[PDB]
Amino acid sequence: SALHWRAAGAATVLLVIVLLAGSYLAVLAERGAPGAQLITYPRALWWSVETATTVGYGDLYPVTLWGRCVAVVVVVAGITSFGLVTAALATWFVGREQERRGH
Amino acid sequence: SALHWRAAGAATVLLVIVLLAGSYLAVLAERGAPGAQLITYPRALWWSVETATTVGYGDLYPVTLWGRCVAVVVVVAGITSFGLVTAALATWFVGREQERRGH
Amino acid sequence: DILLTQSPAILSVSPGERVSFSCRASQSIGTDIHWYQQRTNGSPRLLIKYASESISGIPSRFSGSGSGTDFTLSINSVESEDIANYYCQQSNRWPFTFGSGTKLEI
Amino acid sequence: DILLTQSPAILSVSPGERVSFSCRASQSIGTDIHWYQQRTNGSPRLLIKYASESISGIPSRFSGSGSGTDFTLSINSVESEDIANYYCQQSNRWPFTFGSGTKLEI
Amino acid sequence: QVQLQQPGAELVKPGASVKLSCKASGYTFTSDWIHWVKQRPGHGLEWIGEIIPSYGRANYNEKIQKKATLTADKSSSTAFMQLSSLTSEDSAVYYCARERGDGYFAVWGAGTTVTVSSAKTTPPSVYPLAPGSAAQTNSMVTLGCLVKGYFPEPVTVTWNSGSLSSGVHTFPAVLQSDLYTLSSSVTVPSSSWPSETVTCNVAHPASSTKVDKKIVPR
Ligand SMILES: [K+]
Ligand SMILES: [K+]
Ligand SMILES: [K+]
């Protein structure tokens, strides 16, 4: 269908991939750093979801450079993807409002 | 090209500058305040990225007036810049949807 | 590093009694503790993961409890086959660490 | 202020042995501890930064470990050139602070 | 079936350097980490380090002198640990375990007994042990076998290729002039012997020797 709905879909699939890759890379970057908690996959995945949604619980976060880099990619992909949906919903509303104006 | 893509680009470059200036000023504002943790540049930069993305890990935050002021500027620049991208993506979608309507 | 203290080091129980092994972490670690059993000259065997989750193939009389810094591995009605060394292990913070272990004695 | 306790104040080791200096912080400070060496009448020299990162130009026999509140500076096979005072320093919270120091004695 | 396989023993001269192996089998995920744990006689478990095969990245227990180096052959699903410049302090049983990236070691290898010594590998001498003609017999009979003069540890003593498990005691070896000696005992109903043959199998890894010795009345 329309570009905005495809982009939304694409963004979602992409986000889910970043989430998974992010979980795997966080563990890899963090293991080896004393005091690190982002070291098992199940919670790292919870961490990536937390991060991508910016929910801010603060129960887990990276302590290494590479882990922080992985964090930036994840949050940014999350902010962007959700902003994309917002933009897609606006395109939907703007298009329907034009119709409701018989023009 | 179009205004919205230039603005997005500009916003990004600007955000990166605020991030750096913010890291430097946070250290300057915080050193001298007992209990302060925002006192070395590498982590202050992590803090500014955290702040600008509102990721909410809570591992670092300013404790002084000036540090808090620096925090406001940073988060606001971050919220604004990401909102700008969202708006730019909406302009893109709205423009393409008009084309898809052969008008 | 996270310190895992197992005290007392040796437990003397009578056949059929209920025994309780203790594991105290130096800091809070949720329920990220795991229990292993090692018989004389055998290798470690996972008995309980994440503080209280039973592993398949382990006698129902084995269980664990606790969270934070105090953990317990319990055995309802001990028996000769249970005679061994019992270690706790944590996966909350890097690196993983093991308690010093407690020998069960009937 | 963050208190950095270095105990024992003096370490007696035999040539070739493995020695371990201890540094305990009054609160959790990640791995934000740094180790300095000061020989008789010389000025301090950075040996280990951020708890375990080797500095260029320092004998490979020097290393550090720990995180949170317990830190260790280790020397594999000590030797006359190592005789001195060893201080820890923290950069986690303002102001930076130094431990009271430990003298190595062969 | 055995998911982790390690050679029973390795003898190393001071200053020398051995490479232990760990062949894995069963489900293999990219998220799997292989750990190595050290257990000195009497003492407890000590984490050495870890490695993730699907990347070759390894981490070490930095609280202890670093004597190890980990690598992994993705092709043959084998983990390797390079120990170098060993001393008496490095003699112990080294286990390897598999962790599914979720914090606990679901399965461990049988462990490799590494002995750092200048001595020479010496296979054991298995001598039967049957009662004397003067000793009476109860409802049960006690037989045994003397595994003597071997080096280095360990030795795995079985009875009837594992068939006999109930009534068996194998004592801890003892060192007397760079050579170990131990004895294993077995007890069966007095009636069942010697009609039902009784044999002691003795495998000694350091010399790749496994020998039998049937126990017949004197
Ligand atoms: K937020
Ligand atoms: K938070
Ligand atoms: K938002």
Author numbering:
A (entry chain C), B (entry chain C): 22 to 124
C (entry chain A), D (entry chain A): 1 to 106
E (entry chain B): 1 to 218
Please give the exact wording used by the authors of the publication that reports this structure.
To address this question, we studied a mutant channel, M96V, which crystallographically remains in the nonconductive conformation at K+ concentrations up to 300 mM K+. (B) This stereo-view compares the KcsA-M96V structure (gray) to the KcsA-wt collapsed structure (red) and shows that the M96V mutant remains in the collapsed conformation even at 300 mM KCl. In the ITC assay of this mutant channel, no detectable heat is liberated upon addition of K+. (D) An ITC titration of the M96V mutant with KCl shows no K+ binding. The coupling of an ion-binding event to a conformational change of the filter can explain why the rate of ion binding is slow in the ITC assay.
The ability to distinguish between K+ ions (Pauling ionic radius 1.33 Å) and Na+ ions (Pauling ionic radius 0.95 Å) occurs within a segment of the pore known as the selectivity filter. Inside the selectivity filter, K+ ions are coordinated by oxygen atoms from the protein, which replace the water molecules that normally surround a hydrated ion.
